Amino acid sequence: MELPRAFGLLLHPTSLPGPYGVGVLGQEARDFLRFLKEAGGRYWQVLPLGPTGYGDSPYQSFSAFAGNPYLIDLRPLAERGYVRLEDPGFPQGRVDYGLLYAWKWPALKEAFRGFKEKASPEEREAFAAFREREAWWLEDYALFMALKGAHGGLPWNRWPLPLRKREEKALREAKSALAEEVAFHAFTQWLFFRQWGALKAEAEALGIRIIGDMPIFVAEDSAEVWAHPEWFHLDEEGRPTVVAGVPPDYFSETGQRWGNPLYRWDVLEREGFSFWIRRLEKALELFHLVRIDHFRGFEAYWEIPASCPTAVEGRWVKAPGEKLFQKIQEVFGEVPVLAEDLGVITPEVEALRDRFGLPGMKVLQFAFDXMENPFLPHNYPAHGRVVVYTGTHDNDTTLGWYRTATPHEKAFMARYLADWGITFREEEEVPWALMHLGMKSVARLAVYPVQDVLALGSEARMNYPGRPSGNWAWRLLPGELSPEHGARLRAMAEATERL
C-alpha cells in the first residue's frame, strides 16, 4: 500500500461518549470523525469489532466475522418506534459491562419484536437479502448464539454431542426450534454492518482512513471454530490439546498463555486457506487498512500444551506464512496490512514482513529502558515505512507509564527529548512531548491513543494484560476531547510535515 506522511488516533468505538452506557455507531462517532479531520488527522485506529464474552475482550470474540451488538446505536430504532429507551443510570467515563449486558440485550430483543411488528416490507426484504448474502458465516454465528440461550450460556465444546458434533439433523432441528432467536441474532448483524457501513462512508467523505485490527488466532468459544474443528488442534471432545501464547521473556518471567486454539496449518493449506481469504475480504469491507497482531506467528508460533498453566513449557512450530502471503498477493493483488511485530523478532520474521512490504510498529514507551534501541526515532528505517505509537491499548497511558518508569528511563528520555529540541516542565507534559517526538520522526504514520492526547493517568488504561477484570472499559466524557486539543494536534502536524 501507499503510506503518506500523516498522523491518526487510536480509539475503540466503545470509548466514544454519549448515552446508554457504551460508545455506539451514531452521532458521537461522526462528531469524533469531524474532530479528527479538523485536527489534520487522516487515520482512525480501532480494535477488533466482534461480539465479546467473558472478560469483555475484543480479542476473545464469539466470531471472527460478526460485529459487536453492543456497538449498535439504539437511537434510530427508537425513532422508528421499535423500542422505548429507558436509561438505567450508566456511570460516566466507563463501561459498566454488567449493566450493559443486563440492559442492552433485552432492549435489542425488544427492538426486534417491535421491528417485526411495524417494519415496512422493503425493510424486511433488505434484512432478508442481507441474511442470504452473509449466509456463509451468519447461519453458523446466529445458530451458535441462539444455542447459548438454549444451553445456559455453555461454550460450544460443552453442548450435548449431537449439537457439538454438528449432526445435520440436530442442526436442522435446533434451527427450526430456535427460529426466532436465530433471526434476532441475524438482526443484530444486519444493524451492525449497515451502521458501520454508514460510518465508513462518513470517514471516506471526510478523507479519513480506518485501520482495523485482526488477531492471528481466533477464540476457542466461537462459531467458526465450532463449524470447522478440523482446522484447529482439538481433541474429540472439542477441547484444545495445545494453546497459543509467547514463551518466557525479558519482560515476563512465565510469559503469557493466551488460550487460543491453534491452527492445523497443513490442513488449511491443502484446503486452500479459505479462512484467511474470507477474513481479509471481510476486513477490507470494513476497513481501509488492517493491522494483524502477532504477525510473527505466520512464520512460527509457540505451542503451549493444554495441561500447562503458564507459557514456560512448549515448542516453536513453523507456519507456512510464506505460502499464505504469496496466495494472498496472488489473489488480492495488494496487502494493505500493517504488521504487529513487537516482542522478540528473528531475522526470519523481518524477512517475511519486508518481503511483502508490510510496515511494522514502534512503541516509544519501550524506547528508553536501554541509543541502539530500535524504538528510538534515529534507528527507524531510512524511508520511514513504519507506524510509531507512544503506547498501544495494551500499555498504560503514557502518563501512567511515566509515573512508574525507572529512574534510568526517565533520565534518558529527557536527554533524548532535548537532543530533538523537545523539553517539558511537568510530568503531565510527557504525553505531548513524546507525541511531538513521534511526529518529528521519519515514521510515515504516527498514531496515538486518545488518552495520551488528554494526558490521562493509569485510571484510563485500556487493557492491562494479565489482569482478568477492569479492562476495555475506558470511555471519553461528552466534550472531553475539545476543539483546543484539535487545534494543538493540527499545529503539531503542520509543524512536522504531517498535513
Grid cell digits, residue 180: 426466532
Grid cell digits, residue 31: 462528531
Element (H, E) at 395: none
CA distances from 173 to 160, 170, 413 (A): 14, 5, 63
Judged by DSSP in three states, 430 sits in: helix
Neighbours of 499 (CB within 10 A): 16
Neighbours of 416 (CB within 10 A): 19
Helix axis angle, 179-205 to 274-286, nearest 10°: 60
With cell 488518552, the residue in question is 451
Structural contact between residues 449 and 481, judged by C-beta atoms closer than 8 angstroms: no
Neighbours of 230 (CB within 10 A): 9
Q: Which of 399, 392, 323, 393 is nearest to 363 (CA)?
A: 392
CA dihedral 482, 483, 488, 489 (to 10 degrees): 80
Q: Which of 263, 207, 223, 178 is nearest to 44 (CA)?
A: 207
Beta strand 242-246 pairing with 43-45: unpaired
Taking CA 211 as the corner, what is the angle to CA 209 and CA 215, rounded to the nearest 5 degrees?
165
* Burial group, residue 449, by CB count within 10 angstroms (0-12, 13-18, 19+): buried
The angstrom resolution of this structure is 2.5
d(CA 499, CA 491): 9
Structural contact between residues 385 and 3, judged by C-beta atoms closer than 8 angstroms: yes
Element (H, E) at 166: none
Judged by DSSP in three states, 10 sits in: strand
Judged by DSSP in three states, 303 sits in: strand
Positive or negative CA dihedral for 346, 352, 355, 356?
negative
Contacts of 369 (CB under 8 A, 6+ apart): 406, 408, 409
Grid cell digits, residue 155: 461454550
d(CA 124, CA 149): 24
Domain containing residue 197: 1-499
Grid cell digits, residue 191: 444493524
| Strand-pair partners of 305 | 242
d(CA 261, CA 324): 19
Q: Which of 216, 226, 343 is nearest to 280 (CA)?
A: 216
Grid cell digits, residue 468: 482478568
Q: Which of 67, 76, 106, 70 is nearest to 88 (CA)?
A: 106
Judged by DSSP in three states, 194 sits in: helix
Judged by DSSP in three states, 319 sits in: coil
d(CA 16, CA 14): 6
Structural contact between residues 8 and 45, judged by C-beta atoms closer than 8 angstroms: yes
Grid cell digits, residue 216: 492471528
Grid cell digits, residue 244: 497459543
d(CA 309, CA 306): 8
Q: Which residues are catalytic?
A: 293, 340, 394
Grid cell digits, residue 259: 488460550
For position 25, which CATH number holds? 3.20.20.80
Positive or negative CA dihedral for 475, 13, 113, 159?
negative
CA distances from 392 to 11, 364, 410 (A): 10, 10, 19
Judged by DSSP in three states, 332 sits in: helix
Structural contact between residues 431 and 399, judged by C-beta atoms closer than 8 angstroms: yes
d(CA 258, CA 182): 30
φ and ψ of 178, to 5 deg? -100, 25
> For the residues of 202-249, what is the DSSP string, one character each?
HHHHTT-EEEEEE-SS--SSSHHHHH-GGGB-B-TTS-BSEEEEE---
> For the residues of 111-158, what is the DSSP string, one character each?
HHHHHHHH--HHHHHHHHHHHHHHHHHHHHHHHHHHHHHTTTT--GGG
What is the domain count for the chain? Answer: 1
Judged by DSSP in three states, 257 sits in: strand
Grid cell digits, residue 84: 422505548
Structural contact between residues 364 and 392, judged by C-beta atoms closer than 8 angstroms: no
CA dihedral 150, 62, 190, 196 (to 10 degrees): 150
CA distances from 362 to 168, 340, 441, 449, 464 (A): 49, 9, 11, 14, 19
Grid cell digits, residue 444: 510515515
Q: Is 324 left (phi over 0), alpha (psi -120 to 50) or beta?
A: alpha
Q: Which of 355, 232, 224, 236 is nearest to 278 (CA)?
A: 224
Residues in the chain: 499
CA distances from 369 to 400, 421, 429 (A): 16, 21, 20
Residue type, 306: A
| Residue-wise burial string across 253-263, b where 16 or more C-beta atoms lie within 10 A, e elsewhere | eebbbbbbbbb
Q: Which of 390, 382, 437, 350 is nearest to 45 (CA)?
A: 390
Element (H, E) at 320: none
d(CA 266, CA 264): 6
d(CA 50, CA 58): 6
d(CA 292, CA 490): 29
Positive or negative CA dihedral for 223, 468, 455, 434?
negative
Residue type, 186: A
DSSP classification of residue 476 = P
Contacts of 349 (CB under 8 A, 6+ apart): 295, 296, 299, 300, 341
| Strand-pair partners of 209 | 43
Method: X-ray
Q: Which of 359, 340, 356, 341 is nearest to 444 (CA)?
A: 359
Structural contact between residues 345 and 324, judged by C-beta atoms closer than 8 angstroms: no
φ and ψ of 238, to 5 deg? 90, 10
Q: Which of 23, 200, 226 is nearest to 143 (CA)?
A: 226
Q: Which of 447, 484, 483 is nearest to 5 (CA)?
A: 447
> How far is C-alpha 245 from the geometric centre of its chain's CA atoms?
17
Q: Which of 34, 33, 35 is nearest to 44 (CA)?
A: 33
d(CA 85, CA 420): 53
d(CA 439, CA 446): 6
